[PDB]
């Protein structure tokens, strides 16, 4: 090939990079891990350090309990038989309490209680991780974009698991913890609500999911196409526009009639992605609370 720069031809290695200091509490950084030659073909080879601290540990811990609670239930469903455990691993499911328990936390363990407990650990694990994404940025003096984007994903998960079931009056309305069972749940949700293809926030959501693949293919390919001019060094290209930024912008202007800037493409990017779950969340939230049947709602246009 007229070399495509998908994989490096040569790897170089030097002393581990211990990272910027700023206001990071250095007491909570690990040592550095080993270098990975395997990963070095595609990206950086350095593993670590990682930063832990209170929230990270709380998040890890709480997340492990979540995993453990589900796991122990799966073993229970497999009658403590390892062979059955592996045979039926994808069919195991931890279900929410049945409708007749409403929103009470008074369901017996084997009938939805254990689901409530898992959800509690999951809830703590995710929000404390969110706090972490926010505090890592702050300690380095960075903007909070990552935390705000993550919040968009959290929104869809909150709607599916908590906000919508509460508004519907029943935990039984939440999503089970199982590989196949949450798939069956997804199918069933659409059938019950009169075909989600005719939910317009669902169509919007799909436009941005597709749009995200579109844009990241456009942008990944654009940067590789101008890496022969050092295009991937985008911060310095923002501060001091180079021929990389200019050719990238002219490619698209000539193709399509308009173009982005090196900073501006990243604003297009962050919104394209976060709109997937922002809109999806709204669409799920409205289903069965406000609209029973999307197909029928659609035929009246509203």
């Amino acid at each position: 090939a007229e070399y495509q720069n998908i994989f490096s031809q040569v790897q170089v290695r030097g002393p581990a990079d211990l990272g910027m200091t700023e206001d990071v509490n250095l007491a909570n950084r690990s040592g550095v891990g080993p270098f990975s030659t395997l990963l070095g073909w595609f990206g950086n080879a350095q593993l670590g350090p990682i930063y832990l601290g209170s929230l990270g540990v709380l998040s890890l811990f709480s997340g492990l309990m979540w995993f453990f609670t589900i796991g122990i239930w799966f073993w229970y469903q497999a009658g403590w038989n390892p062979a059955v455990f592996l045979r039926d691993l994808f069919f195991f499911s931890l279900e929410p309490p049945a409708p007749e328990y409403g929103l009470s936390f008074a369901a017996p363990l084997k009938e939805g209680g254990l689901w409530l407990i898992a959800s509690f650990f999951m809830f703590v694990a995710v929000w404390s991780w969110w706090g972490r994404t926010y505090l890592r940025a702050q300690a380095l003096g960075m903007g909070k974009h990552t935390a705000w984007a993550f919040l968009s994903a959290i929104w869809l998960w909150m709607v599916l698991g908590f906000i919508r079931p509460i508004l519907m009056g029943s935990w039984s309305e939440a999503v089970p913890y199982g590989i196949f069972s949450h798939l069956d749940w997804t199918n069933n949700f659409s059938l019950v609500h009169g075909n989600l293809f005719y939910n317009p926030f669902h169509g919007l959501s799909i436009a941005f999911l597709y749009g995200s693949a579109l844009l990241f293919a456009m942008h990944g390919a654009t940067i590789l196409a101008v890496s022969r001019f050092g295009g991937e060094r985008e911060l310095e290209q923002i501060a001091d526009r180079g021929t990389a930024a200019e050719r990238a912008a002219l490619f698209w202007r000539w193709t399509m009639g308009f173009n982005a800037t090196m900073e501006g493409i990243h604003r297009w990017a962050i919104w394209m992605a976060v709109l997937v779950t922002l809109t999806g969340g709204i669409g799920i939230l409205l289903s069965g609370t406000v609209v029973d049947n999307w197909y029928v709602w659609g035929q009246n246009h509203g």
């Binding site: 007229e2 070399y3 720069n5 490096s8 031809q9 040569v10 790897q11 170089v12 290695r13 030097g14 002393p15 990079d17 910027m20 270098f35 030659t37 070095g40 073909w41 950086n44 080879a45 350095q46 317009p200 926030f201 919007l204 890496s227 022969r228 001019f229 050092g230 060094r233 310095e236 923002i238 501060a239 001091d240 526009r241 180079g242 021929t243 930024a245 200019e246 912008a249 308009f258 173009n259 982005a260 800037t261 090196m262 900073e263 501006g264 493409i265 604003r267 297009w268 919104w271 809109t279 709204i282 409205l286 406000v290 609209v291 709602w297 509203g302």
Partner: protein
């Protein structure tokens, strides 16, 4: 109907959002210009954004965009038509004049710095203790042009230290001097380095750096632009 309300509201939001993103992407390159360099009359339906300022690290100053732009370099092209929309032809040697695929931008004649204030890019012999950890080491290999003639031999690798990445080969020419080659424009083989963009006698015209241990942003543009321009302008010597 609350669903109706919601979907009409979101479309309002989305239009405001798009207008924001588009204006925000007009911080470079605008106002539009006529082909004679005067401002175009039709600037489009989106206004220029109000200025924003970046405070560059390491005392390098501030950047405000948008702001009045120059090329800050003479451009050796002649208009080929009375009307608007046709190619501008090079009046001289486009490789040397830095036009078309061989263009470069007048970036700051300073090297890029890492987070600690040190030069981001260094020759590997000056970087303790980087070494080649996988793949074919190109040091000491012959460098061959598109004319299948040897142009020199690889004497060092210039590495992006924070990223731990090879960015240039330093190549020694027959006359003893050296040149940098973008790592992206070379093909490292078992017994040689092959460079498709240039014939062996065009290596000498690769711009030179004024320090043997650092390269500036201006120099990297000049080097990269010139080598990439070879694909269009050195094609006659690209061997049948």
């Amino acid at each position: 109907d609350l669903a109706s309300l919601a979907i009409y509201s979101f479309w309002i939001f989305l239009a405001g959002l798009i207008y924001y993103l588009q204006t925000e992407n007009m911080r470079e390159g605008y106002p539009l210009e006529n082909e004679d360099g005067t401002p175009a009359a039709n600037q489009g339906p989106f206004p220029l954004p109000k200025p924003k300022t970046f405070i560059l690290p390491h005392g390098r100053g501030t950047l405000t965009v948008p702001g009045p732009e120059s090329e800050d370099r003479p451009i050796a092209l002649a208009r080929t038509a009375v009307s608007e929309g046709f190619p501008h032809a090079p009046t001289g040697d486009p490789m040397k004049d830095g036009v078309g695929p061989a263009s470069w931008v007048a970036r700051r004649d300073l090297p890029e710095l890492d987070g600690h204030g040190h030069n981001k890019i260094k020759p590997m012999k000056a970087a303790a203790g980087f070494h080649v950890s996988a793949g074919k080491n190109p040091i000491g290999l012959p460098v061959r042009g598109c004319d299948l003639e040897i142009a020199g031999k690889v004497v060092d690798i210039w590495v992006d230290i924070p990223e731990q990445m090879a960015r240039f080969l330093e190549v020694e020419l027959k006359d003893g001097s050296t040149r940098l080659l973008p790592m992206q424009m070379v093909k490292v083989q078992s017994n040689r380095v092959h460079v498709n963009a240039l014939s062996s006698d065009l290596f000498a015209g690769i711009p030179t750096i004024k320090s043997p241990t650092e390269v500036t942003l201006l120099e990297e543009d000049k080097i990269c632009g010139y080598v990439a321009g070879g694909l269009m302008y050195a094609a006659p010597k690209r061997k049948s």
